[PDB]
PDB file of C-alpha atoms in Angstrom:
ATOM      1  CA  UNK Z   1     -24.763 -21.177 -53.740  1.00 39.03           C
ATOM      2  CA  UNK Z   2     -25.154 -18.528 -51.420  1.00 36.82           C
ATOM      3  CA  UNK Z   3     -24.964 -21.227 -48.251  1.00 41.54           C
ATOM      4  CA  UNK Z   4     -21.856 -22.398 -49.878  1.00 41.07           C
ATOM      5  CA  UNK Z   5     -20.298 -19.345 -50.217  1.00 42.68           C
ATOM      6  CA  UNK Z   6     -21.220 -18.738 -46.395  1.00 41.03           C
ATOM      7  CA  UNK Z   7     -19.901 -21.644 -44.956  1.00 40.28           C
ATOM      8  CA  UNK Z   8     -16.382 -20.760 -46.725  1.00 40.49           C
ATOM      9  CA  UNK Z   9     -16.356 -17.155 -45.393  1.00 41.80           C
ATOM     10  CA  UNK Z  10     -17.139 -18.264 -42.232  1.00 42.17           C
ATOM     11  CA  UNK Z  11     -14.647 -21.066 -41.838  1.00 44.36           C
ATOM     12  CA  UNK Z  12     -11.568 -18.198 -43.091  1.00 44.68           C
ATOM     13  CA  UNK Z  13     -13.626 -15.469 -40.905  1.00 46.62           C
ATOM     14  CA  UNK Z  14     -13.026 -18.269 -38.293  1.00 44.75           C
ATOM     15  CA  UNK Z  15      -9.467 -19.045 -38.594  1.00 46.75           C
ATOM     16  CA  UNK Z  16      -8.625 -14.762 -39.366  1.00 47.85           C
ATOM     17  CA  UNK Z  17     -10.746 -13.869 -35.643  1.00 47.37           C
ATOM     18  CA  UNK Z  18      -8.589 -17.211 -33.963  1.00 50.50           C
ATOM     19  CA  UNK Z  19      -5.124 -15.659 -35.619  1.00 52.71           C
ATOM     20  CA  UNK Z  20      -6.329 -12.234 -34.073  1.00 53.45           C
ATOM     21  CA  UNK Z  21      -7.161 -13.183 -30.813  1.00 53.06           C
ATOM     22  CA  UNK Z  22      -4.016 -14.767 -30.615  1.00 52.24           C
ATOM     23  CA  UNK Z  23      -2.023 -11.714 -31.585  1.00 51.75           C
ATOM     24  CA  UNK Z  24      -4.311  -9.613 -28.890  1.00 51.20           C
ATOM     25  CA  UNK Z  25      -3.620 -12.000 -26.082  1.00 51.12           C
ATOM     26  CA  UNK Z  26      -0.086 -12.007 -27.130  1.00 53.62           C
ATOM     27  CA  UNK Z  27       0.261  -8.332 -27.278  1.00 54.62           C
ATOM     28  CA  UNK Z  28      -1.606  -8.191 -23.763  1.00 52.10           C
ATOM     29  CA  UNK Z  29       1.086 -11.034 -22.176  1.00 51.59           C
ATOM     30  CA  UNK Z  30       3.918  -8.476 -23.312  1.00 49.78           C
ATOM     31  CA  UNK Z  31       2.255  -6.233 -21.198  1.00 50.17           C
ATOM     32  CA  UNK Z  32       2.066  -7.964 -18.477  1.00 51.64           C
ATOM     33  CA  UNK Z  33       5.787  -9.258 -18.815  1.00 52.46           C
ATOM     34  CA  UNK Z  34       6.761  -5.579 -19.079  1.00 53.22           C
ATOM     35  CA  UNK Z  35       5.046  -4.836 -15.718  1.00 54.95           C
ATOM     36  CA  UNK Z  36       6.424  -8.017 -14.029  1.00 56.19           C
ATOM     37  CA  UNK Z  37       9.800  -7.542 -15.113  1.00 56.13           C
ATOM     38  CA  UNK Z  38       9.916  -4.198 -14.077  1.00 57.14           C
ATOM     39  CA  UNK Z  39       8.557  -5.554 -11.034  1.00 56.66           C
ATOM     40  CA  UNK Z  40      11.168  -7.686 -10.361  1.00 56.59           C
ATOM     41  CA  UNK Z  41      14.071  -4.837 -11.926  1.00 58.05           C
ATOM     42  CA  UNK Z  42      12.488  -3.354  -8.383  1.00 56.35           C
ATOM     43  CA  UNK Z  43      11.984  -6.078  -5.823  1.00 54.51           C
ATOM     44  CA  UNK Z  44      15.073  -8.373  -6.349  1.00 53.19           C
ATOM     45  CA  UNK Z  45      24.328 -11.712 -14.221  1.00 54.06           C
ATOM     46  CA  UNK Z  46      21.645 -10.660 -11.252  1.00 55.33           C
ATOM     47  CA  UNK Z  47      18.017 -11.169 -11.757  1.00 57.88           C
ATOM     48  CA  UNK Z  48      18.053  -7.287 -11.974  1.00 60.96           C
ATOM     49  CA  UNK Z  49      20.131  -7.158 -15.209  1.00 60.10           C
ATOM     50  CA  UNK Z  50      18.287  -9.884 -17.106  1.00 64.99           C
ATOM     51  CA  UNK Z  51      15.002  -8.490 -16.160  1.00 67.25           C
ATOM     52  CA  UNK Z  52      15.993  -5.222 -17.263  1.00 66.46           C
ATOM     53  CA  UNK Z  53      16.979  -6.844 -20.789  1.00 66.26           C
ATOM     54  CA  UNK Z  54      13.701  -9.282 -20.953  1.00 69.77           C
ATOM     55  CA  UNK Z  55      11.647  -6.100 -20.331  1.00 70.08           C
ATOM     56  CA  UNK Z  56      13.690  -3.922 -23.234  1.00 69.13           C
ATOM     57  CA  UNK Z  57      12.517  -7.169 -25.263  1.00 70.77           C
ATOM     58  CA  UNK Z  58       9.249  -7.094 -24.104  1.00 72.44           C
ATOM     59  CA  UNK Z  59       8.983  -3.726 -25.381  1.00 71.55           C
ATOM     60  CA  UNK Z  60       9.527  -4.248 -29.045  1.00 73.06           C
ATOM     61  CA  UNK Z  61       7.954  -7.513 -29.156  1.00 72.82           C
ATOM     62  CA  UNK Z  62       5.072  -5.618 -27.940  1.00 71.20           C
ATOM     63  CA  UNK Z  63       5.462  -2.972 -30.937  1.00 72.32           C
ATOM     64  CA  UNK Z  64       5.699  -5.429 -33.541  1.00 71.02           C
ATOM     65  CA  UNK Z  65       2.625  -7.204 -32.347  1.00 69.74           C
ATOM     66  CA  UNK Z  66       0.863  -4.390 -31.938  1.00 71.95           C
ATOM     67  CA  UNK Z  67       1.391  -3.865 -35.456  1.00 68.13           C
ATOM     68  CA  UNK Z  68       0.783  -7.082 -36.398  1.00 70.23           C
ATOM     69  CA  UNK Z  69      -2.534  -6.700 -34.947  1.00 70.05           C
ATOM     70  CA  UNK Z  70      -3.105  -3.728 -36.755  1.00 69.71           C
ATOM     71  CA  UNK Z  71      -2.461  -5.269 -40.177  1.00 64.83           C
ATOM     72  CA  UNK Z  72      -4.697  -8.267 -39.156  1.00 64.59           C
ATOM     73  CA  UNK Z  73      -7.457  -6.346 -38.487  1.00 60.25           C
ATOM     74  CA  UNK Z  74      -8.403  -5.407 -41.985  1.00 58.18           C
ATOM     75  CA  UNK Z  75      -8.863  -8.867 -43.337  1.00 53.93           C
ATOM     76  CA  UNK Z  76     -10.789 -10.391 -40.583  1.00 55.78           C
ATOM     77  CA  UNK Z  77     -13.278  -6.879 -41.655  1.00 61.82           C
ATOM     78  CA  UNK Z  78     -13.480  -7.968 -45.624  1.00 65.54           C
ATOM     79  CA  UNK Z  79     -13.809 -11.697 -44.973  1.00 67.28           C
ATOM     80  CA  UNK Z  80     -17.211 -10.579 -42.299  1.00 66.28           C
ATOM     81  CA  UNK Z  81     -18.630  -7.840 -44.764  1.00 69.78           C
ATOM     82  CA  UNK Z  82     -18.649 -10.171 -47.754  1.00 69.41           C
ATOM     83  CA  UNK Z  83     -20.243 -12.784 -45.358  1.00 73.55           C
ATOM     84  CA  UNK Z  84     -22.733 -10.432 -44.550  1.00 73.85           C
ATOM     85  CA  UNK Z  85     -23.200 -10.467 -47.682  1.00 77.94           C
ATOM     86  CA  UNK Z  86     -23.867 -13.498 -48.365  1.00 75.76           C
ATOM     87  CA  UNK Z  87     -26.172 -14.108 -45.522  1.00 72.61           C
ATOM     88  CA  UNK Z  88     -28.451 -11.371 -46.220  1.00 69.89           C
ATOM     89  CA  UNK Z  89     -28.875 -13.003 -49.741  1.00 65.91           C
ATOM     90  CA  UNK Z  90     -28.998 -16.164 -48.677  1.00 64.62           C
ATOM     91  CA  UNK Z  91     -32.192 -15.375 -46.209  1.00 62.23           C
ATOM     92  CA  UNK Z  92     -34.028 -14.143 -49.209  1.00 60.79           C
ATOM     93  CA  UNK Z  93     -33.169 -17.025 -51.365  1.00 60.34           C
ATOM     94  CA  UNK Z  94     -34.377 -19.759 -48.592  1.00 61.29           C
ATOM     95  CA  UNK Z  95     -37.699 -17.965 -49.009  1.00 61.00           C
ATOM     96  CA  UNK Z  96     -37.910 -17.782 -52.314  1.00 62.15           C
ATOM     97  CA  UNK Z  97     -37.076 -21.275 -52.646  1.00 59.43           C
ATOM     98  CA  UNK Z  98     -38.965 -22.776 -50.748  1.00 61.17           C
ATOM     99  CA  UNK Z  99     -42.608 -21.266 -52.292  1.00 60.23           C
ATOM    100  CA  UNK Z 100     -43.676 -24.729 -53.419  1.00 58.57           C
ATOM    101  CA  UNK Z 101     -43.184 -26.747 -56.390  1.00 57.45           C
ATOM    102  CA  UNK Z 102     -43.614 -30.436 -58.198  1.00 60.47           C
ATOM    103  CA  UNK Z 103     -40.530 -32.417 -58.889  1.00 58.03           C
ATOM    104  CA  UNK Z 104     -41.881 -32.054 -62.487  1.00 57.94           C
ATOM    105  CA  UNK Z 105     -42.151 -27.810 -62.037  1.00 57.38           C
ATOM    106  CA  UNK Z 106     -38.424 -28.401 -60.860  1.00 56.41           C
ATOM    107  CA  UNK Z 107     -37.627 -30.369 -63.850  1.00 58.17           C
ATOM    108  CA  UNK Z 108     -39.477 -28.376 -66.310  1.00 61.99           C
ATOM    109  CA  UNK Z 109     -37.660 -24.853 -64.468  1.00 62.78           C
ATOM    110  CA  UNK Z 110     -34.026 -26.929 -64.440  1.00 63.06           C
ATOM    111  CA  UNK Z 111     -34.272 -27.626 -67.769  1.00 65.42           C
ATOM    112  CA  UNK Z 112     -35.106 -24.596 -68.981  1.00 64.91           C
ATOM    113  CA  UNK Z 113     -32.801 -22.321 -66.941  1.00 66.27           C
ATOM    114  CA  UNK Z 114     -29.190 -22.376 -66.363  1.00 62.38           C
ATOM    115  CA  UNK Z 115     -27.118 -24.043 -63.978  1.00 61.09           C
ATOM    116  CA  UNK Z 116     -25.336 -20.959 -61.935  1.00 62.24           C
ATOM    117  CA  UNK Z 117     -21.600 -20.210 -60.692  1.00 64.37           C
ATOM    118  CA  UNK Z 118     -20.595 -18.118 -57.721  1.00 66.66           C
ATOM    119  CA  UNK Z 119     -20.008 -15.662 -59.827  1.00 65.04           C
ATOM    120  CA  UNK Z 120     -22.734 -15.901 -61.848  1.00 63.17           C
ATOM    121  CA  UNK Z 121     -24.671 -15.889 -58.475  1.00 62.56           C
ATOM    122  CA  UNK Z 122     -24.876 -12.207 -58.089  1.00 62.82           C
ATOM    123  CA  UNK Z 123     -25.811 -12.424 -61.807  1.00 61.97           C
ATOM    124  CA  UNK Z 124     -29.010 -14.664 -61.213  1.00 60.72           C
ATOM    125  CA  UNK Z 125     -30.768 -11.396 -59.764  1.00 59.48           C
ATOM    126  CA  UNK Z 126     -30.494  -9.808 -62.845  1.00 56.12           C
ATOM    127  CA  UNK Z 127     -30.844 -12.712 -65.341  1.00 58.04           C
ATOM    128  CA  UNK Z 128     -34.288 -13.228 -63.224  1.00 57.09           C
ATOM    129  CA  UNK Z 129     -35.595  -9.943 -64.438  1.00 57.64           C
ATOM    130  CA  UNK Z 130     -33.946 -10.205 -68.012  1.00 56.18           C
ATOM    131  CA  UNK Z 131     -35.481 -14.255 -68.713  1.00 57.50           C
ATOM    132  CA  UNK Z 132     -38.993 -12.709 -67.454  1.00 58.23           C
ATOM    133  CA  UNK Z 133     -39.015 -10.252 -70.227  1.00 59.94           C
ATOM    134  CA  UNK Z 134     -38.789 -12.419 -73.077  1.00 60.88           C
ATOM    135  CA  UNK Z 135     -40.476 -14.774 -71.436  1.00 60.31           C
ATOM    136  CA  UNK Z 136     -43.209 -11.976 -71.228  1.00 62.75           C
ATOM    137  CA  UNK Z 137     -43.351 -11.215 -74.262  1.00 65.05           C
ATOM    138  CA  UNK Z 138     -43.601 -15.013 -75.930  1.00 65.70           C
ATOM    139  CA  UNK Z 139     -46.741 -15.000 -73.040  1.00 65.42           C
ATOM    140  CA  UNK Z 140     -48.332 -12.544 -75.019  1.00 65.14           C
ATOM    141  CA  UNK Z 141     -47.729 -13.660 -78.318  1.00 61.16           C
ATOM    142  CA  UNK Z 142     -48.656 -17.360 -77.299  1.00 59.37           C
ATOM    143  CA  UNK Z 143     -51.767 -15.763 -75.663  1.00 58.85           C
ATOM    144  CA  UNK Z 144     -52.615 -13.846 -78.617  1.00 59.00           C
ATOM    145  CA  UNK Z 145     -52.649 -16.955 -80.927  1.00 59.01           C
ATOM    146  CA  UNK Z 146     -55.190 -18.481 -78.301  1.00 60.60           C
ATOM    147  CA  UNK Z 147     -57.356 -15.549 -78.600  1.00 60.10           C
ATOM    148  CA  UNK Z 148     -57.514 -16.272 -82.571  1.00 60.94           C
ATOM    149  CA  UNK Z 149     -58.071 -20.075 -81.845  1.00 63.37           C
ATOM    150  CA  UNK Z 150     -61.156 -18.249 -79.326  1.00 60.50           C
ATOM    151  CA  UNK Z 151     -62.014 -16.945 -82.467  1.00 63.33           C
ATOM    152  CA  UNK Z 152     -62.206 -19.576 -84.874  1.00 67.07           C
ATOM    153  CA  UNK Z 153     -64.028 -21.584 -81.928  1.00 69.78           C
ATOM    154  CA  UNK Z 154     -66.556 -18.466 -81.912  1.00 67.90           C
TER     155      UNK Z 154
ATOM    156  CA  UNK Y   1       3.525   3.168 -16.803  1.00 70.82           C
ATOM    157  CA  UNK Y   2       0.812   0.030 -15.652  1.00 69.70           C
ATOM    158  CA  UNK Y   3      -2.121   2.966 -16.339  1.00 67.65           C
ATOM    159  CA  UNK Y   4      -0.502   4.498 -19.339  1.00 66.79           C
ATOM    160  CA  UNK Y   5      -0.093   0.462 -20.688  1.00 67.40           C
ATOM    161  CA  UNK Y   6      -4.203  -0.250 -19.911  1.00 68.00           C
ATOM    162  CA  UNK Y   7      -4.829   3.350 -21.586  1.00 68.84           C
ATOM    163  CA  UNK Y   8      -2.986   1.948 -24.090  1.00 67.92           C
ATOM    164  CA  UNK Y   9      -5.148  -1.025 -24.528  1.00 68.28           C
ATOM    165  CA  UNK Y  10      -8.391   0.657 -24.391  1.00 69.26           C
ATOM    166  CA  UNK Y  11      -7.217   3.615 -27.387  1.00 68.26           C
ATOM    167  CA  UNK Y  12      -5.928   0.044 -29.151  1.00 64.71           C
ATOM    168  CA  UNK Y  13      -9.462  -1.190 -28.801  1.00 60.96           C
ATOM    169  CA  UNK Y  14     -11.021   2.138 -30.260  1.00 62.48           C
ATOM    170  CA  UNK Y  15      -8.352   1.842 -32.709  1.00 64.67           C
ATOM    171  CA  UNK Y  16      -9.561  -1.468 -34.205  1.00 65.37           C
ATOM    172  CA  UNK Y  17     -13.508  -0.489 -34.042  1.00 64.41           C
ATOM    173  CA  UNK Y  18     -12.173   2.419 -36.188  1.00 65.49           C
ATOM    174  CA  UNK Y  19     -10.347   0.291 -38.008  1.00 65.59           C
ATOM    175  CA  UNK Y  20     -13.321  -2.031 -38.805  1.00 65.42           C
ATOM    176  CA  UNK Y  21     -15.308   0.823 -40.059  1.00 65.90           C
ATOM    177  CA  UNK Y  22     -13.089   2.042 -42.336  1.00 70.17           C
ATOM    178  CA  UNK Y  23     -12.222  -1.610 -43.725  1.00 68.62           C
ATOM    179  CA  UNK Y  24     -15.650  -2.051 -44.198  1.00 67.27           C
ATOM    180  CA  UNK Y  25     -16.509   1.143 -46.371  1.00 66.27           C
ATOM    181  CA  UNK Y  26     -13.358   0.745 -47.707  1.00 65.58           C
ATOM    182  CA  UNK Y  27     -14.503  -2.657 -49.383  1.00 68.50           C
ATOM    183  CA  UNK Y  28     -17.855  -0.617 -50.066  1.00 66.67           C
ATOM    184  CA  UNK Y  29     -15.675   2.537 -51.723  1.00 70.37           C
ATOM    185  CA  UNK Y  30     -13.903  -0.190 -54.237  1.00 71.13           C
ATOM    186  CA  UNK Y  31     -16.887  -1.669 -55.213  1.00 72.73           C
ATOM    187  CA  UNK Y  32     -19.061   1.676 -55.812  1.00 72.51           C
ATOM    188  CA  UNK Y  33     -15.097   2.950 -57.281  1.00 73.02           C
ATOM    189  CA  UNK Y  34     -15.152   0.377 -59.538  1.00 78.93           C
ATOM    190  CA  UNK Y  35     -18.658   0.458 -60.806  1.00 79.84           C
ATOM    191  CA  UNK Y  36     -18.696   3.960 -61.485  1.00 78.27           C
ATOM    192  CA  UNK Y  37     -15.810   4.033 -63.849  1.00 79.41           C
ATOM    193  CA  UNK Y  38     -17.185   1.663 -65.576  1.00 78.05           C
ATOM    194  CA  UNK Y  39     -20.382   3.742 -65.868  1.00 79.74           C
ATOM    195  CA  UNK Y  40     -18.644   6.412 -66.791  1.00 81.01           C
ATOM    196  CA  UNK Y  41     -16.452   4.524 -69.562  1.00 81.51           C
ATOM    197  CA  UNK Y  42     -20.053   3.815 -70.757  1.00 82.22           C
ATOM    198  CA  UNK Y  43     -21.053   7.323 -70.995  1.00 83.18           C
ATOM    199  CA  UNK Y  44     -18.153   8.621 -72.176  1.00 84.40           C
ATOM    200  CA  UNK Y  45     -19.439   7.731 -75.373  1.00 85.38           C
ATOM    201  CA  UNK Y  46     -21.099  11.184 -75.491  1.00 85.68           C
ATOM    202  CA  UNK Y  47     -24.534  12.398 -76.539  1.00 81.01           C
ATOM    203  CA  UNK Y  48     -25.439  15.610 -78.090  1.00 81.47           C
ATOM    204  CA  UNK Y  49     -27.480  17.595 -75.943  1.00 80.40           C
ATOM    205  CA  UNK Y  50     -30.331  16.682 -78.290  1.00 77.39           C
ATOM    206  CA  UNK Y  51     -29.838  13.001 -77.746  1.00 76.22           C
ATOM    207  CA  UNK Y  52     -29.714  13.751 -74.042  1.00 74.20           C
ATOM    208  CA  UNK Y  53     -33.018  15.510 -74.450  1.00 71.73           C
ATOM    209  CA  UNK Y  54     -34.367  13.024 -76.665  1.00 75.75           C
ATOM    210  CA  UNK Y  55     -33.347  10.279 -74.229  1.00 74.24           C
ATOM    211  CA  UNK Y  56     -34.863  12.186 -71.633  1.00 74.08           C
ATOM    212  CA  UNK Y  57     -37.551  11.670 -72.570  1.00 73.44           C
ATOM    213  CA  UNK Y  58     -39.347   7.643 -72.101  1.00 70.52           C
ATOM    214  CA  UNK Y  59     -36.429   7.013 -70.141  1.00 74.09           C
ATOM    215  CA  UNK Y  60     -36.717   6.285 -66.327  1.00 75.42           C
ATOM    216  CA  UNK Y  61     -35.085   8.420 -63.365  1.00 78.75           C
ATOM    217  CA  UNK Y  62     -33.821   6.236 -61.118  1.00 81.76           C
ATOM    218  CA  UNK Y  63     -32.007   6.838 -57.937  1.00 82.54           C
ATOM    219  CA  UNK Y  64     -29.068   5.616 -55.957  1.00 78.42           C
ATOM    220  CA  UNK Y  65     -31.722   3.146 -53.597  1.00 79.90           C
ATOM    221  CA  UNK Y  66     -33.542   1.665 -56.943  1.00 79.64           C
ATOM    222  CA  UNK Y  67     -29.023   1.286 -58.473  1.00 77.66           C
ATOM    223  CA  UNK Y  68     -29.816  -2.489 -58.557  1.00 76.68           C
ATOM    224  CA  UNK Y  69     -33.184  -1.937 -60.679  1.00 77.39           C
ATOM    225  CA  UNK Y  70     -31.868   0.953 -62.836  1.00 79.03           C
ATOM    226  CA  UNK Y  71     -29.930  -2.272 -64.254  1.00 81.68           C
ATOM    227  CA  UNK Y  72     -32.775  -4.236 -65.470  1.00 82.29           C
ATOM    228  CA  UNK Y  73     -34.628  -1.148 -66.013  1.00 80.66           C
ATOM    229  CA  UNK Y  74     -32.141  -0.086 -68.887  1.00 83.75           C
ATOM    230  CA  UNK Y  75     -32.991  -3.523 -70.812  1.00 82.81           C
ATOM    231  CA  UNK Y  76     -36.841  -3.238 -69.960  1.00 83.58           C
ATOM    232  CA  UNK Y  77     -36.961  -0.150 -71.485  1.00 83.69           C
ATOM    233  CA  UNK Y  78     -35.037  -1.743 -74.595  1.00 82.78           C
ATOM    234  CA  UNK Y  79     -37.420  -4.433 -74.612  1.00 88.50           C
ATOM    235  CA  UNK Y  80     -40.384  -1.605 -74.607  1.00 87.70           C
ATOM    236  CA  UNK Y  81     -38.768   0.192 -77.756  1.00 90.22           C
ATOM    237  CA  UNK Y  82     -38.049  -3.264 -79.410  1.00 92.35           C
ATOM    238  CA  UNK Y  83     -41.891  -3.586 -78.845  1.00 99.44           C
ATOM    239  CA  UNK Y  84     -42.797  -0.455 -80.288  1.00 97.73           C
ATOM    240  CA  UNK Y  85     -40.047  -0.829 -83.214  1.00 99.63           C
ATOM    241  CA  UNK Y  86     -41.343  -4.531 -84.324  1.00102.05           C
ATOM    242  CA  UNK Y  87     -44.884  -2.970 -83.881  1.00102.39           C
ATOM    243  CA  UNK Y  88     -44.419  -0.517 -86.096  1.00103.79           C
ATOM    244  CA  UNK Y  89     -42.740  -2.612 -88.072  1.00 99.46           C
ATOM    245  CA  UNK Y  90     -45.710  -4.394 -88.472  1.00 98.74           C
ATOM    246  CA  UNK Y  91     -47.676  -2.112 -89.668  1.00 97.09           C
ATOM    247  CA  UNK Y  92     -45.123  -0.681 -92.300  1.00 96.42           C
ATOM    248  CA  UNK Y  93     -44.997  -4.140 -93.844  1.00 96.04           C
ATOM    249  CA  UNK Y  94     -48.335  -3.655 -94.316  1.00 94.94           C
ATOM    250  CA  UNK Y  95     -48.490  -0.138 -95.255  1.00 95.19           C
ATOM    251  CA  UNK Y  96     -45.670  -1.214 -98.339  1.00 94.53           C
ATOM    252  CA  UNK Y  97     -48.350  -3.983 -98.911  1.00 93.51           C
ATOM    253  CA  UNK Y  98     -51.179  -1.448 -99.467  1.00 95.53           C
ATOM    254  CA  UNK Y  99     -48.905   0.556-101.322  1.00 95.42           C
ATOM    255  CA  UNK Y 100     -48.185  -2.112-104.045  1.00 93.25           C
TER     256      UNK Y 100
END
């Protein structure tokens, strides 16, 4: 679950940093357009006039997509942190895994435990810990009818 | 106005790294925001100051490293008292035996 949920966050982390970049390298051509066209509002219905009007243009374009970039920003920073997320889970749960077990352990642990969600995912920590107790507690009442079957054998 | 436009860049860069840090413990704030309402909607059930001493007491301390565990700690410790209270259940069953 937890590689699933990483491959997802990093194919929208993916698409959010693309979208970003793009807005950047926009914002970054409007400054260069401002620079040229005041270039040319220097060195040249004359070129002067439109220049002078492309680089007013340039100007706000540049504002809004600073913005833009600005409002961007914060989603492309939730999408990573909940990846992180799920990474630093998912090392730990490759280990754990991977401890060694018979196709019949798998079966027997399958059958008995449930099936989890993505939601539920977070919830497997804690349902760990909360299975083991009562499953602690039938080990010691299982193991204290073995101790009277010790006894009869005795 | 070329300077002031590259200064401009590099504060827009700071900007964002700012930006990135506060998204980040913003997400955390929300979470840890949302949790402890809830906690407190669960304690707002109120305890006499004797059944906050008397909790006190065989109840864990747990800090804000161990929040995860203080989770599963709180139905441990029920499954301890549900120990001691079918124990001593036990044995009254068997004291109400004698007593017959």
């Amino acid at each position: 679950l937890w590689r699933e949920k990483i491959n997802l966050l990093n194919a929208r982390l993916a698409e959010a940093q693309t979208s970003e970049e793009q807005l950047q390298s926009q914002l970054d051509l409007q400054k260069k357009v401002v620079s040229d066209h005041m270039q040319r509002y220097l060195q040249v219905d004359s070129d002067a006039s439109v220049a002078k009007a492309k680089l007013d243009e340039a100007q706000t374009i540049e504002s809004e997509l600073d913005k833009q970039l600005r409002a961007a920003n914060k989603v492309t920073c939730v999408l990573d942190t909940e990846l992180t997320l799920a990474r630093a889970a998912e090392r730990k749960a490759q280990q754990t895994a991977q401890q060694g077990m018979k196709e019949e352990e798998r079966e027997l642990s399958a059958s008995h435990f449930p099936v989890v969600t993505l939601e539920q995912l977070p919830d497997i920590r804690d349902l760990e810990r909360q299975h083991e107790r009562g499953i602690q507690h039938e080990i010691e009442r299982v193991k204290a009818e073995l101790h009277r079957l010790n006894i009869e054998l005795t």
